[PDB]
Amino acid sequence: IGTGFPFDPHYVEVLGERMHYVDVGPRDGTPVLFLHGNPTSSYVWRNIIPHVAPTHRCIAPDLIGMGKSDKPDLGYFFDDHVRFMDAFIEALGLEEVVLVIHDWGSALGFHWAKRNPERVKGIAFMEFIRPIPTWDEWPEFARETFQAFRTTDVGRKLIIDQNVFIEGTLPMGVVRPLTEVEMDHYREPFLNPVDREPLWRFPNELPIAGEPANIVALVEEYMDWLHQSPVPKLLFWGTPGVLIPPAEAARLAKSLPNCKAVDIGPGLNLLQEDNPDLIGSEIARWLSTL
Ligand SMILES: *CCCCCCNC(=O)CN(C)S(=O)(=O)c1ccc(N(C)C)c2nsnc12
Ligand SMILES: [Cl-]
């Protein structure tokens, strides 16, 4: 599995800020938009894009405050990302797109697809955001850790000062052992503690046990749309998973209209890091059928 990032930088002005994105492949077709989540960047798609780039345009932005994009002093709430990603998509002059989305990128991708259904010809998704009914279902320490993250005293000392979301939570979401070179690529954006604000805000935005209600409602809305939407779907899942366990994946595979499911094998959250070749190859095959 490749550790390098051999993609030239592209930048565009979005709501007064500069956003970095990968942009490769032919212009004469339908572009594929890749949206990462917390605490990753376009780096998470590095081994998947090369399977799609030969035939389709691949666009992989770094969310505002993350990757190589600018880091303004903001709260970095979900609505803040929604606004920047909206203006990013319009800045590139994109009409119709295929979405490839993960974690908080899935929230952005689904929320966009809901509001712009005519402009979405396909949605490939994996380990995506859904409402979590209770804390009790969480594993012992994961419960303790994320409840702690969702505070201003301990959570900030953990994520901001100690950088545990990068140093601990991130590699714990990969089944295989992430190398130090790969960790360094993920560490790069957050060397300065002040730049770690999005890393702390995202876990506080997670819809867990009704809180926050605004995020829960927003998430509930795009799930309803997805059940009703006849758009083609590709759901990658792994065992035991994290946000999406194997039983939930099989359930949605049957429930969601026009939805092929793919088993990547062993996997937690960053499925891209455990089986990039299968995810990359299957997306390409799936695109050639659309
Ligand atoms: C999608 C945003 C978080 C992804 C960060 C990657 N790291 C992990 O997922 C680490 N996990 C293995 S965890 O042990 O911290 C963990 C365990 C369980 C759950 N759930 C019960 C959903 C979880 N949600 S986020 N991290 C989790
Ligand atoms: Cl998070």
PDB file of N, CA, C and O and ligand atoms in Angstrom, residues 37-40 102-106 126-130 132 134-135 137-139 141-143 145-146 149 165 168-174 202-203 206 208 241-245 268-270, ligand 1:
ATOM      1  N   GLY A  37     -13.176  12.879   5.788  1.00  0.00           N
ATOM      2  CA  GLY A  37     -13.729  13.313   7.070  1.00  0.00           C
ATOM      3  C   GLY A  37     -12.662  13.561   8.119  1.00  0.00           C
ATOM      4  O   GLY A  37     -11.543  13.969   7.797  1.00  0.00           O
ATOM      5  N   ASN A  38     -13.015  13.310   9.379  1.00  0.00           N
ATOM      6  CA  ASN A  38     -12.136  13.578  10.513  1.00  0.00           C
ATOM      7  C   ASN A  38     -11.350  12.322  10.895  1.00  0.00           C
ATOM      8  O   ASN A  38     -11.945  11.251  11.032  1.00  0.00           O
ATOM      9  N   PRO A  39     -10.018  12.439  11.094  1.00  0.00           N
ATOM     10  CA  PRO A  39      -9.124  13.587  11.014  1.00  0.00           C
ATOM     11  C   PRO A  39      -8.214  13.486   9.793  1.00  0.00           C
ATOM     12  O   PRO A  39      -6.996  13.634   9.906  1.00  0.00           O
ATOM     13  N   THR A  40      -8.804  13.213   8.637  1.00  0.00           N
ATOM     14  CA  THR A  40      -8.035  12.854   7.457  1.00  0.00           C
ATOM     15  C   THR A  40      -7.933  14.035   6.491  1.00  0.00           C
ATOM     16  O   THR A  40      -8.178  15.182   6.870  1.00  0.00           O
ATOM     17  N   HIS A 102     -16.972   9.596   2.826  1.00  0.00           N
ATOM     18  CA  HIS A 102     -16.561   8.841   4.009  1.00  0.00           C
ATOM     19  C   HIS A 102     -16.632   9.697   5.273  1.00  0.00           C
ATOM     20  O   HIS A 102     -16.238  10.862   5.258  1.00  0.00           O
ATOM     21  N   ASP A 103     -17.131   9.111   6.362  1.00  0.00           N
ATOM     22  CA  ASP A 103     -17.175   9.786   7.661  1.00  0.00           C
ATOM     23  C   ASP A 103     -17.901  11.140   7.532  1.00  0.00           C
ATOM     24  O   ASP A 103     -18.989  11.185   6.965  1.00  0.00           O
ATOM     25  N   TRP A 104     -17.311  12.239   8.008  1.00  0.00           N
ATOM     26  CA  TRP A 104     -17.964  13.549   7.926  1.00  0.00           C
ATOM     27  C   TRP A 104     -18.106  14.046   6.488  1.00  0.00           C
ATOM     28  O   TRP A 104     -18.933  14.914   6.215  1.00  0.00           O
ATOM     29  N   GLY A 105     -17.302  13.500   5.576  1.00  0.00           N
ATOM     30  CA  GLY A 105     -17.492  13.736   4.147  1.00  0.00           C
ATOM     31  C   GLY A 105     -18.821  13.203   3.637  1.00  0.00           C
ATOM     32  O   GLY A 105     -19.418  13.785   2.730  1.00  0.00           O
ATOM     33  N   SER A 106     -19.281  12.096   4.218  1.00  0.00           N
ATOM     34  CA  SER A 106     -20.576  11.510   3.864  1.00  0.00           C
ATOM     35  C   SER A 106     -21.734  12.419   4.266  1.00  0.00           C
ATOM     36  O   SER A 106     -22.688  12.585   3.504  1.00  0.00           O
ATOM     37  N   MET A 126     -19.061   4.812   2.462  1.00  0.00           N
ATOM     38  CA  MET A 126     -18.444   3.862   3.382  1.00  0.00           C
ATOM     39  C   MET A 126     -18.296   4.509   4.753  1.00  0.00           C
ATOM     40  O   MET A 126     -17.986   5.698   4.848  1.00  0.00           O
ATOM     41  N   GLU A 127     -18.537   3.732   5.807  1.00  0.00           N
ATOM     42  CA  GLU A 127     -18.362   4.198   7.184  1.00  0.00           C
ATOM     43  C   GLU A 127     -18.857   5.634   7.367  1.00  0.00           C
ATOM     44  O   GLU A 127     -18.094   6.544   7.708  1.00  0.00           O
ATOM     45  N   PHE A 128     -20.156   5.809   7.147  1.00  0.00           N
ATOM     46  CA  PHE A 128     -20.765   7.134   7.039  1.00  0.00           C
ATOM     47  C   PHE A 128     -21.501   7.531   8.315  1.00  0.00           C
ATOM     48  O   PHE A 128     -21.726   6.702   9.200  1.00  0.00           O
ATOM     49  N   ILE A 129     -21.873   8.805   8.396  1.00  0.00           N
ATOM     50  CA  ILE A 129     -22.522   9.356   9.582  1.00  0.00           C
ATOM     51  C   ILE A 129     -24.012   9.016   9.599  1.00  0.00           C
ATOM     52  O   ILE A 129     -24.733   9.283   8.634  1.00  0.00           O
ATOM     53  N   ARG A 130     -24.453   8.422  10.704  1.00  0.00           N
ATOM     54  CA  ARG A 130     -25.871   8.171  10.963  1.00  0.00           C
ATOM     55  C   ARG A 130     -26.156   8.487  12.435  1.00  0.00           C
ATOM     56  O   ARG A 130     -25.218   8.622  13.228  1.00  0.00           O
ATOM     57  N   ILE A 132     -26.802   7.901  16.238  1.00  0.00           N
ATOM     58  CA  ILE A 132     -26.491   6.844  17.204  1.00  0.00           C
ATOM     59  C   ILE A 132     -27.433   6.980  18.409  1.00  0.00           C
ATOM     60  O   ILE A 132     -27.319   7.945  19.169  1.00  0.00           O
ATOM     61  N   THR A 134     -27.824   5.475  21.456  1.00  0.00           N
ATOM     62  CA  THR A 134     -27.377   5.427  22.856  1.00  0.00           C
ATOM     63  C   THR A 134     -25.863   5.326  23.030  1.00  0.00           C
ATOM     64  O   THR A 134     -25.139   4.958  22.104  1.00  0.00           O
ATOM     65  N   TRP A 135     -25.404   5.664  24.233  1.00  0.00           N
ATOM     66  CA  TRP A 135     -24.000   5.511  24.623  1.00  0.00           C
ATOM     67  C   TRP A 135     -23.684   4.081  25.061  1.00  0.00           C
ATOM     68  O   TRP A 135     -22.573   3.598  24.844  1.00  0.00           O
ATOM     69  N   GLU A 137     -24.344   1.174  23.968  1.00  0.00           N
ATOM     70  CA  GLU A 137     -23.898   0.255  22.910  1.00  0.00           C
ATOM     71  C   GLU A 137     -22.406   0.388  22.561  1.00  0.00           C
ATOM     72  O   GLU A 137     -21.826  -0.526  21.973  1.00  0.00           O
ATOM     73  N   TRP A 138     -21.797   1.521  22.911  1.00  0.00           N
ATOM     74  CA  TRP A 138     -20.371   1.745  22.661  1.00  0.00           C
ATOM     75  C   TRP A 138     -19.506   0.768  23.462  1.00  0.00           C
ATOM     76  O   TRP A 138     -19.866   0.401  24.582  1.00  0.00           O
ATOM     77  N   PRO A 139     -18.362   0.341  22.892  1.00  0.00           N
ATOM     78  CA  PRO A 139     -17.379  -0.403  23.681  1.00  0.00           C
ATOM     79  C   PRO A 139     -16.888   0.400  24.890  1.00  0.00           C
ATOM     80  O   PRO A 139     -16.879   1.632  24.852  1.00  0.00           O
ATOM     81  N   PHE A 141     -14.133   1.483  26.584  1.00  0.00           N
ATOM     82  CA  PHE A 141     -13.199   2.609  26.562  1.00  0.00           C
ATOM     83  C   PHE A 141     -13.537   3.646  25.490  1.00  0.00           C
ATOM     84  O   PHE A 141     -13.311   4.839  25.693  1.00  0.00           O
ATOM     85  N   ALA A 142     -14.074   3.197  24.355  1.00  0.00           N
ATOM     86  CA  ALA A 142     -14.528   4.110  23.301  1.00  0.00           C
ATOM     87  C   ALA A 142     -15.621   5.045  23.821  1.00  0.00           C
ATOM     88  O   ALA A 142     -15.663   6.223  23.458  1.00  0.00           O
ATOM     89  N   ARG A 143     -16.502   4.509  24.666  1.00  0.00           N
ATOM     90  CA  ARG A 143     -17.518   5.304  25.355  1.00  0.00           C
ATOM     91  C   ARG A 143     -16.862   6.365  26.237  1.00  0.00           C
ATOM     92  O   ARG A 143     -17.196   7.546  26.149  1.00  0.00           O
ATOM     93  N   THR A 145     -13.806   7.512  26.138  1.00  0.00           N
ATOM     94  CA  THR A 145     -12.962   8.412  25.353  1.00  0.00           C
ATOM     95  C   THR A 145     -13.768   9.514  24.659  1.00  0.00           C
ATOM     96  O   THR A 145     -13.394  10.685  24.721  1.00  0.00           O
ATOM     97  N   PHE A 146     -14.868   9.142  24.007  1.00  0.00           N
ATOM     98  CA  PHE A 146     -15.665  10.109  23.237  1.00  0.00           C
ATOM     99  C   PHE A 146     -16.551  11.002  24.108  1.00  0.00           C
ATOM    100  O   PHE A 146     -16.822  12.148  23.741  1.00  0.00           O
ATOM    101  N   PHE A 149     -14.020  13.462  25.010  1.00  0.00           N
ATOM    102  CA  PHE A 149     -13.844  14.352  23.856  1.00  0.00           C
ATOM    103  C   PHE A 149     -14.943  15.407  23.796  1.00  0.00           C
ATOM    104  O   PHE A 149     -14.680  16.565  23.463  1.00  0.00           O
ATOM    105  N   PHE A 165      -6.328  12.591  18.979  1.00  0.00           N
ATOM    106  CA  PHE A 165      -7.196  12.197  17.869  1.00  0.00           C
ATOM    107  C   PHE A 165      -6.353  11.783  16.662  1.00  0.00           C
ATOM    108  O   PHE A 165      -6.698  10.840  15.948  1.00  0.00           O
ATOM    109  N   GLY A 168      -3.715   8.777  18.392  1.00  0.00           N
ATOM    110  CA  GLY A 168      -4.366   7.579  18.933  1.00  0.00           C
ATOM    111  C   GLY A 168      -5.605   7.149  18.166  1.00  0.00           C
ATOM    112  O   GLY A 168      -5.653   6.041  17.626  1.00  0.00           O
ATOM    113  N   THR A 169      -6.604   8.026  18.114  1.00  0.00           N
ATOM    114  CA  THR A 169      -7.896   7.696  17.505  1.00  0.00           C
ATOM    115  C   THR A 169      -7.761   7.320  16.027  1.00  0.00           C
ATOM    116  O   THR A 169      -8.376   6.352  15.576  1.00  0.00           O
ATOM    117  N   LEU A 170      -6.952   8.070  15.284  1.00  0.00           N
ATOM    118  CA  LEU A 170      -6.756   7.817  13.852  1.00  0.00           C
ATOM    119  C   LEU A 170      -6.235   6.401  13.550  1.00  0.00           C
ATOM    120  O   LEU A 170      -6.908   5.646  12.848  1.00  0.00           O
ATOM    121  N   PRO A 171      -5.046   6.033  14.074  1.00  0.00           N
ATOM    122  CA  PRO A 171      -4.520   4.694  13.772  1.00  0.00           C
ATOM    123  C   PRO A 171      -5.339   3.547  14.371  1.00  0.00           C
ATOM    124  O   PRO A 171      -5.276   2.424  13.868  1.00  0.00           O
ATOM    125  N   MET A 172      -6.096   3.826  15.431  1.00  0.00           N
ATOM    126  CA  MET A 172      -7.010   2.831  16.003  1.00  0.00           C
ATOM    127  C   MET A 172      -8.183   2.513  15.061  1.00  0.00           C
ATOM    128  O   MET A 172      -8.835   1.480  15.213  1.00  0.00           O
ATOM    129  N   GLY A 173      -8.437   3.395  14.091  1.00  0.00           N
ATOM    130  CA  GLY A 173      -9.450   3.159  13.058  1.00  0.00           C
ATOM    131  C   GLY A 173      -8.973   2.411  11.819  1.00  0.00           C
ATOM    132  O   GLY A 173      -9.726   2.278  10.852  1.00  0.00           O
ATOM    133  N   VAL A 174      -7.727   1.934  11.838  1.00  0.00           N
ATOM    134  CA  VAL A 174      -7.179   1.108  10.760  1.00  0.00           C
ATOM    135  C   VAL A 174      -6.810  -0.263  11.327  1.00  0.00           C
ATOM    136  O   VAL A 174      -6.121  -0.346  12.343  1.00  0.00           O
ATOM    137  N   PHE A 202     -15.478  18.249  15.531  1.00  0.00           N
ATOM    138  CA  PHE A 202     -16.168  17.160  14.828  1.00  0.00           C
ATOM    139  C   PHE A 202     -16.778  16.102  15.763  1.00  0.00           C
ATOM    140  O   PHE A 202     -17.952  15.765  15.613  1.00  0.00           O
ATOM    141  N   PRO A 203     -15.992  15.571  16.723  1.00  0.00           N
ATOM    142  CA  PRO A 203     -16.588  14.617  17.671  1.00  0.00           C
ATOM    143  C   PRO A 203     -17.723  15.209  18.521  1.00  0.00           C
ATOM    144  O   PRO A 203     -18.639  14.481  18.906  1.00  0.00           O
ATOM    145  N   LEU A 206     -20.953  14.959  16.407  1.00  0.00           N
ATOM    146  CA  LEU A 206     -21.488  13.618  16.155  1.00  0.00           C
ATOM    147  C   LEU A 206     -22.870  13.449  16.794  1.00  0.00           C
ATOM    148  O   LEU A 206     -23.040  13.754  17.978  1.00  0.00           O
ATOM    149  N   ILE A 208     -25.083  11.724  18.726  1.00  0.00           N
ATOM    150  CA  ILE A 208     -25.079  10.620  19.686  1.00  0.00           C
ATOM    151  C   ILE A 208     -26.095  10.890  20.796  1.00  0.00           C
ATOM    152  O   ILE A 208     -25.961  11.860  21.547  1.00  0.00           O
ATOM    153  N   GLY A 241     -16.203  -3.065  11.501  1.00  0.00           N
ATOM    154  CA  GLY A 241     -16.660  -1.701  11.249  1.00  0.00           C
ATOM    155  C   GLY A 241     -16.581  -0.848  12.502  1.00  0.00           C
ATOM    156  O   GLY A 241     -16.060  -1.288  13.530  1.00  0.00           O
ATOM    157  N   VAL A 242     -17.097   0.375  12.415  1.00  0.00           N
ATOM    158  CA  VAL A 242     -17.126   1.303  13.551  1.00  0.00           C
ATOM    159  C   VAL A 242     -18.459   2.052  13.571  1.00  0.00           C
ATOM    160  O   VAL A 242     -19.293   1.810  14.444  1.00  0.00           O
ATOM    161  N   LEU A 243     -18.660   2.957  12.616  1.00  0.00           N
ATOM    162  CA  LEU A 243     -19.936   3.657  12.475  1.00  0.00           C
ATOM    163  C   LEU A 243     -21.006   2.753  11.859  1.00  0.00           C
ATOM    164  O   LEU A 243     -22.195   2.917  12.140  1.00  0.00           O
ATOM    165  N   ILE A 244     -20.577   1.807  11.023  1.00  0.00           N
ATOM    166  CA  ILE A 244     -21.482   0.917  10.297  1.00  0.00           C
ATOM    167  C   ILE A 244     -21.056  -0.545  10.482  1.00  0.00           C
ATOM    168  O   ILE A 244     -20.177  -1.028   9.765  1.00  0.00           O
ATOM    169  N   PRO A 245     -21.673  -1.261  11.443  1.00  0.00           N
ATOM    170  CA  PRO A 245     -21.326  -2.677  11.608  1.00  0.00           C
ATOM    171  C   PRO A 245     -21.883  -3.551  10.473  1.00  0.00           C
ATOM    172  O   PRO A 245     -22.764  -3.099   9.737  1.00  0.00           O
ATOM    173  N   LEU A 268     -12.248  -1.207  10.055  1.00  0.00           N
ATOM    174  CA  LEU A 268     -12.849  -0.437  11.141  1.00  0.00           C
ATOM    175  C   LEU A 268     -13.500   0.827  10.569  1.00  0.00           C
ATOM    176  O   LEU A 268     -14.628   0.747  10.092  1.00  0.00           O
ATOM    177  N   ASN A 269     -12.809   1.970  10.589  1.00  0.00           N
ATOM    178  CA  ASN A 269     -13.357   3.208  10.015  1.00  0.00           C
ATOM    179  C   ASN A 269     -12.717   3.598   8.680  1.00  0.00           C
ATOM    180  O   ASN A 269     -13.423   3.850   7.702  1.00  0.00           O
ATOM    181  N   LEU A 270     -11.388   3.661   8.647  1.00  0.00           N
ATOM    182  CA  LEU A 270     -10.662   4.038   7.429  1.00  0.00           C
ATOM    183  C   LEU A 270     -10.488   2.823   6.511  1.00  0.00           C
ATOM    184  O   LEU A 270      -9.386   2.280   6.381  1.00  0.00           O
TER     185      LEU A 270
HETATM  186  C1  LIG B   1     -15.630   8.944  11.602  1.00  0.00           C
HETATM  187  C2  LIG B   1     -14.957   9.871  12.591  1.00  0.00           C
HETATM  188  C3  LIG B   1     -14.077   9.108  13.572  1.00  0.00           C
HETATM  189  C4  LIG B   1     -13.039   8.266  12.843  1.00  0.00           C
HETATM  190  C5  LIG B   1     -11.711   8.204  13.580  1.00  0.00           C
HETATM  191  C6  LIG B   1     -10.969   6.901  13.280  1.00  0.00           C
HETATM  192  N1  LIG B   1     -10.748   6.153  14.499  1.00  0.00           N
HETATM  193  C7  LIG B   1     -11.626   5.293  15.012  1.00  0.00           C
HETATM  194  O1  LIG B   1     -12.707   5.039  14.501  1.00  0.00           O
HETATM  195  C8  LIG B   1     -11.197   4.630  16.304  1.00  0.00           C
HETATM  196  N2  LIG B   1     -12.253   3.695  16.753  1.00  0.00           N
HETATM  197  C9  LIG B   1     -11.828   2.305  16.500  1.00  0.00           C
HETATM  198  S1  LIG B   1     -12.761   3.908  18.284  1.00  0.00           S
HETATM  199  O2  LIG B   1     -12.263   2.873  19.151  1.00  0.00           O
HETATM  200  O3  LIG B   1     -12.358   5.172  18.833  1.00  0.00           O
HETATM  201  C10 LIG B   1     -14.358   3.842  18.182  1.00  0.00           C
HETATM  202  C11 LIG B   1     -15.059   2.731  18.652  1.00  0.00           C
HETATM  203  C12 LIG B   1     -16.450   2.636  18.563  1.00  0.00           C
HETATM  204  C13 LIG B   1     -17.242   3.637  17.993  1.00  0.00           C
HETATM  205  N3  LIG B   1     -18.644   3.479  17.932  1.00  0.00           N
HETATM  206  C14 LIG B   1     -19.359   2.716  18.947  1.00  0.00           C
HETATM  207  C15 LIG B   1     -19.424   4.063  16.846  1.00  0.00           C
HETATM  208  C16 LIG B   1     -16.595   4.871  17.445  1.00  0.00           C
HETATM  209  N4  LIG B   1     -17.165   5.951  16.849  1.00  0.00           N
HETATM  210  S2  LIG B   1     -15.919   7.008  16.439  1.00  0.00           S
HETATM  211  N5  LIG B   1     -14.599   6.126  17.012  1.00  0.00           N
HETATM  212  C17 LIG B   1     -15.091   4.972  17.537  1.00  0.00           C
END
